[PDB]
Write a protein that binds this ligand. Structure first.
Ligand SMILES: [K+]
Length: 225
């Protein structure tokens, strides 16, 4: 595709989210860079409206799969880069088991030489003393597989996966993800064979930063072919 050549080096990334969860409104801004040669993302997010009303870990997935390392033998299955520079719409429902759900819609595209992810999140039916609104999740690390399949009728893809969010002194808060991506442009895109993205997210803090924030180091690699 044309789009693949946009990712051969280090690309600056901007993320902007507006959220509304059980009536609590909030915004997040993120900056960093992605190096798709290595599947490597480094990002820092700030809650610009003050204190974040959900746990940071629950927003990682929402807050640029075009930075996946696709092995050379799977380059024909890389929908994400094939949609660039015009981009794709990424939409999700995220099902928090025994709790509410997030519904997200994002546009991922280049603005100049900057890869931008603009997101609207709406969360409904959360328990106000639940693990999410009660801030009962650990802040550390999670890893999983994003199972991707073609959706020929929207000229895009679907995916699904499950995140096991660690509960502080406890088990796991499951977060079932259902995803669709559709190209923004009229251009052609690569419709993939079934495969997955193996993704590892490491969360940390900037010792100098007083705002509510999250530092993210993530690796994303396509596999399963
Ligand atoms: K938390």
């Amino acid at each position: 595709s044309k789009g693949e050549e946009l990712f051969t080096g280090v690309v600056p990334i901007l993320v902007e989210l507006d959220g509304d969860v059980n009536g609590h409104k909030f915004s997040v801004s993120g900056e960093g860079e992605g190096d798709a040669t290595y599947g490597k993302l480094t990002l820092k997010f700030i809650c610009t409206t003050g204190k974040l009303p959900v746990p940071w870990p629950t927003l990682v997935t929402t807050l640029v799969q075009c930075f996946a390392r696709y092995p050379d033998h799977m380059k024909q299955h890389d929908f994400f880069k094939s949609a660039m520079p015009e981009g794709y719409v990424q939409e999700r429902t995220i099902f928090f088991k025994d709790d509410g759900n997030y519904k997200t819609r994002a546009e991922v595209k280049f603005e100049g030489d900057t890869l931008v992810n603009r997101i609207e999140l709406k969360g409904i039916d959360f328990k106000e003393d639940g693990n999410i609104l009660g801030h009962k999740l650990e802040y550390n690390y999670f890893s999983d597989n994003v199972y991707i399949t073609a959706d020929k009728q929207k000229n895009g893809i679907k995916a699904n996966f499950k995140i096991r969010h660690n509960i502080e002194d406890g088990g796991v808060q499951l977060a079932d993800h259902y995803q669709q991506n559709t190209p923004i442009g009229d251009g052609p895109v690569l419709l993939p064979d079934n495969h997955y993205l193996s993704t590892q997210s490491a969360l940390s803090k900037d010792p100098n930063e007083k705002r509510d924030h999250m530092v993210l180091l993530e690796f994303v690699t396509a596999a399963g072919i």
